[PDB]
Design an enzyme around this catalytic site. Structure first.
Site, mmCIF file in Angstrom:
data_model
loop_
_atom_site.group_PDB
_atom_site.id
_atom_site.type_symbol
_atom_site.label_atom_id
_atom_site.label_comp_id
_atom_site.label_asym_id
_atom_site.label_seq_id
_atom_site.Cartn_x
_atom_site.Cartn_y
_atom_site.Cartn_z
ATOM 1 N N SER A 43 -55.174 14.823 -12.475
ATOM 2 C CA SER A 43 -53.557 14.761 -12.387
ATOM 3 C C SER A 43 -52.896 15.147 -10.803
ATOM 4 O O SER A 43 -51.670 14.601 -10.986
ATOM 5 C CB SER A 43 -53.231 15.646 -13.317
ATOM 6 O OG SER A 43 -53.259 17.061 -12.993
ATOM 7 N N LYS A 78 -50.348 14.123 -24.487
ATOM 8 C CA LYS A 78 -49.998 13.128 -23.339
ATOM 9 C C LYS A 78 -49.443 12.012 -23.775
ATOM 10 O O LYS A 78 -48.640 11.944 -24.530
ATOM 11 C CB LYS A 78 -51.097 13.365 -22.166
ATOM 12 C CG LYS A 78 -51.144 14.464 -21.518
ATOM 13 C CD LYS A 78 -52.196 14.997 -20.551
ATOM 14 C CE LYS A 78 -52.565 16.084 -20.319
ATOM 15 N NZ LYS A 78 -53.269 16.902 -21.327
ATOM 16 N N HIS A 110 -55.510 12.187 -18.823
ATOM 17 C CA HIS A 110 -54.563 11.498 -18.478
ATOM 18 C C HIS A 110 -55.112 9.903 -18.190
ATOM 19 O O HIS A 110 -54.210 9.216 -17.852
ATOM 20 C CB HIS A 110 -54.228 11.916 -16.754
ATOM 21 C CG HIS A 110 -53.526 13.357 -16.728
ATOM 22 N ND1 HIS A 110 -52.309 13.523 -16.618
ATOM 23 C CD2 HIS A 110 -54.116 14.665 -16.644
ATOM 24 C CE1 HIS A 110 -51.951 14.651 -16.586
ATOM 25 N NE2 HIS A 110 -53.161 15.371 -16.804
HETATM 26 C C1 LIG Z 1 -57.130 16.909 -17.146
HETATM 27 C C2 LIG Z 1 -56.722 17.933 -18.123
HETATM 28 N N1 LIG Z 1 -57.708 18.409 -18.966
HETATM 29 C C3 LIG Z 1 -57.202 19.222 -19.748
HETATM 30 C C4 LIG Z 1 -55.799 19.531 -20.138
HETATM 31 C C5 LIG Z 1 -55.546 20.725 -21.416
HETATM 32 O O1 LIG Z 1 -54.840 19.868 -22.340
HETATM 33 P P1 LIG Z 1 -53.566 20.628 -23.156
HETATM 34 O O2 LIG Z 1 -52.322 20.605 -22.635
HETATM 35 O O3 LIG Z 1 -53.422 19.612 -24.317
HETATM 36 O O4 LIG Z 1 -54.264 21.907 -23.602
HETATM 37 C C6 LIG Z 1 -54.840 19.137 -19.071
HETATM 38 C C7 LIG Z 1 -53.707 19.722 -19.323
HETATM 39 N N2 LIG Z 1 -52.464 19.091 -18.331
HETATM 40 C C8 LIG Z 1 -51.272 19.638 -18.485
HETATM 41 C C9 LIG Z 1 -50.707 20.390 -19.351
HETATM 42 O O5 LIG Z 1 -50.416 19.618 -20.870
HETATM 43 C C10 LIG Z 1 -51.090 20.921 -17.196
HETATM 44 O O6 LIG Z 1 -49.916 21.296 -16.798
HETATM 45 O O7 LIG Z 1 -52.060 21.193 -16.660
HETATM 46 C C11 LIG Z 1 -55.269 18.351 -18.287
HETATM 47 O O8 LIG Z 1 -54.194 17.935 -17.252
#
Ligand SMILES: Cc1ncc(COP(=O)(O)O)c(CN[C@@H](CO)C(=O)O)c1O
Ligand SMILES: Cc1ncc(COP(=O)(O)O)c(CN[C@@H](CO)C(=O)O)c1O
Lengths: 394, 394
Positions: free
Chosen positions: B184, B243, B212
């Site tokens: 991300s 997401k 993502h």
């Molecule tokens: C690659 C990946 N794997 C897992 C998660 C965790 O998922 P959740 O936010 O639905 O708990 C995220 C969360 N990502 C966001 C919150 O949703 C963040 O700000 O980190 C992620 O980007």
């Protein structure tokens, strides 16, 4: 690739054996709202295996608050609270929880489990210590593993073992003691007066997990510190919304400076999407009902006192409960699985506790009360339990 | 007690300093649904800091599926899936995800974060190894810390470093490689073809986190394995519902034997309450819209290609993105905070990435696209960014 992975899971045969014997009763697919009766395979089953202590997941007011928040705010916030996932209603719920448990500030988490991960992972670091009651919930053990601190278990409600283990640690280190308030296995309450007396003598921080305490003990259900008058001696009050509060999520409340540190340093709040609007609104309206309508807590304890007295009168071997969790010892894994399935097939839902989680000789079923249970439903469940325990020859 | 605890948090001054300078822009309290425009302090702000890639949190069909599940099933299940918290609709969603990503079986978790904790904590044990891309999400690092295995990081998308580190390990041990699909920070895609080639040579299990990727890449949005044609070479496909799928929760999909092991051994599913009914139903109806209405993914990529081309034409320094995440390098923590707040005060919401998460010289803002954005809104945000970057002298 799967060769070694297939070898890692190859020895896990209990589920296969339960299914083959017709004893399997995990992941039972319910077809209706969580209530005192649930539909499973089209038939009605008495629910004595819930954490919905006040029966509020069916309250029409709470349902409509949730549906109204969906209308206004949609299905999700699509980001961490830290970034784009805070709503005015999250902030409102933090303020209303902070007032309820008598603390300056609170931070929400999307689950109760993540609410323990946050403070236990980020406050104590290298060269500090976390002290855990050995019966603490899995989320507390896991949150402690995520810290860079040394984690020390002490004997269950063993204040001499806690005091001796603290005694030994370097003075020039931080310590944090984390305990369940109500322990869910046996439904017993932490010795908070002695624990906090020890913490004060060693300047250790105190964190209480009130998952099973909120809506159950304390003034208007405010939890374990409230129950003992020890708000000032507990640094962090953690709770969940998935039990009395009929929702999903949790929180940690405390001093504003500590809460400000957590909300910017706990990976389980910086890197996980925020609570759904519907769950914020259901938790808010459950919280206002628990305080404004004392009848729910009162009926929970009437049901608890009635069921406990009826189980003791029939000669069941109960654990040392001080809560609406009634642990019924069986002391055989085979009998615990058989009794669980026989009860399910006679329309009664209870939860088994077996090896490897406990020793075979400490295996039990957990019978939990809801405010919404009737004495008739309690009577029906106990008369079926008497019949099954005879059929099983416990 | 608070003495040592106050010393542990005493050095954390960045938030105090941001607030005092009028630069603070975390936990911004939104007053409306997550959408291309949000209300903050009563004013309308363009949202370019979301993960709602398909804009579905406002879809009336998804809202009404959630409200209808509240009516039928109430506000919560009040137990773990393992015990009293499974509904027929959880099982339905598992079957529909397993079909979508082309796997035998799936298990839901109440958050995406907990979906990584589960398999990473319980499959590799003492004497085994987990290999992690060094840029993996926090939840993957934390899930790996919960294992009893040795965790090894490899250089970001560095297949020679992965291959060398695997090479060295004892043959008589299990290994598991876990990677983000889309990363991300910079919006780049894992080299899944080479990673899976290496995994096959060392019989290492492969787990991809498609947080993502789902709804973004792959056929009808089915994710990173789908994008590369490598379904057969990935053992575990993890995803989130917070997401593209506009909800809360996540899942792990794979072979039925592995999934059966996880659902009975992962502490984050045995010891955490199940997804709310409203979130199961919103995820189910989002999943059916993503597949049945190709226009959403198509419009997401039109917006992404248009914005990216416009940012490059204005001479912004973009990271190596292959996704609707457009990372805009600033390379100064002070300028990154200032640009973030100046954009907020001009009605544009973007997310800062700063020290200590990255080095000052790699600090950036993340500008993410939604299918529901218009070219007009993109034009307004980029012309404000041009003005702020000048005012900031980047
Ligand atoms: C690659 C990946 N794997 C897992 C998660 C965790 O998922 P959740 O936010 O639905 O708990 C995220 C969360 N990502 C966001 C919150 O949703 C963040 O700000 O980190 C992620 O980007
Ligand atoms: C003391 C305590 N602390 C924390 C949690 C985690 O809360 P959550 O289930 O809301 O995530 C639980 C969960 N207890 C249930 C699931 O809700 C269980 O089956 O383990 C708990 O009992």
């Amino acid at each position: 690739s799967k060769g070694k992975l297939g070898e890692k899971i190859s020895q896990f045969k209990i589920v296969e054996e339960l299914k083959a014997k017709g004893l399997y009763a995990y992941f039972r697919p319910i077809q209706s709202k969580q209530d005192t009766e649930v539909k499973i395979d089209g038939r009605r089953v008495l629910m004595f295996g819930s954490n919905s202590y006040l029966g509020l997941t069916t309250d029409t007011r709470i349902i409509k608050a949730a549906q109204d928040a969906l209308e206004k705010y949609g299905t999700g916030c699509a980001g961490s609270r830290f970034l784009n996932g805070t709503l005015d209603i999250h902030v409102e719920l933090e303020e209303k929880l902070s007032a309820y448990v008598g603390k300056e500030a609170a931070i929400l988490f999307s689950t109760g489990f993540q609410s323990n991960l946050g403070p236990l992972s980020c406050l104590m670091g290298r060269n500090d210590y976390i002290l855990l009651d050995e019966r603490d919930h899995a989320s507390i053990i896991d949150g402690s593993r995520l810290s860079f601190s040394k984690v020390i278990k002490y004997g269950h409600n063993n204040m001499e073992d806690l005091r001796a283990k603290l005694s030994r640690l370097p003075e020039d280190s931080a310590k944090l003691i984390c305990t369940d308030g109500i322990f869910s296995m046996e439904g017993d309450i932490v010795n908070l007066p002695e624990l906090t007396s020890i913490a004060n003598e060693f300047d250790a921080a105190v964190m209480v997990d009130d998952a099973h305490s909120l809506g159950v003990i304390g003034h208007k259900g405010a939890g374990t510190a409230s129950h003992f008058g020890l708000n000032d001696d507990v640094d962090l009050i953690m709770g969940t919304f998935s039990k009395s509060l009929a929702s999903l999520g949790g929180f940690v409340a405390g001093d504003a400076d500590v809460i400000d540190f957590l909300k910017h340093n706990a990976r389980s709040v910086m890197f996980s999407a925020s609570m759904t609007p519907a769950s914020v609104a259901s938790t808010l309206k459950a919280l206002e009902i628990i305080q404004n309508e004392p009848e729910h807590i009162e009926k929970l304890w009437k049901n608890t006192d009635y069921a406990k007295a009826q189980l003791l009168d029939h000669g069941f071997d109960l654990g040392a409960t001080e809560s609406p969790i009634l642990p019924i010892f069986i002391r055989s894994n085979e009998k615990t699985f058989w009794v669980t399935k026989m009860l399910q097939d006679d329309g009664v839902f209870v939860n088994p506790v077996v090896s490897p989680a406990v020793p075979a000789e400490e295996s039990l079923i957990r019978f939990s009360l809801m405010a919404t249970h009737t004495y008739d439903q309690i009577d029906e469940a106990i008369e079926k339990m008497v019949k099954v325990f005879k059929q099983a020859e416990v």
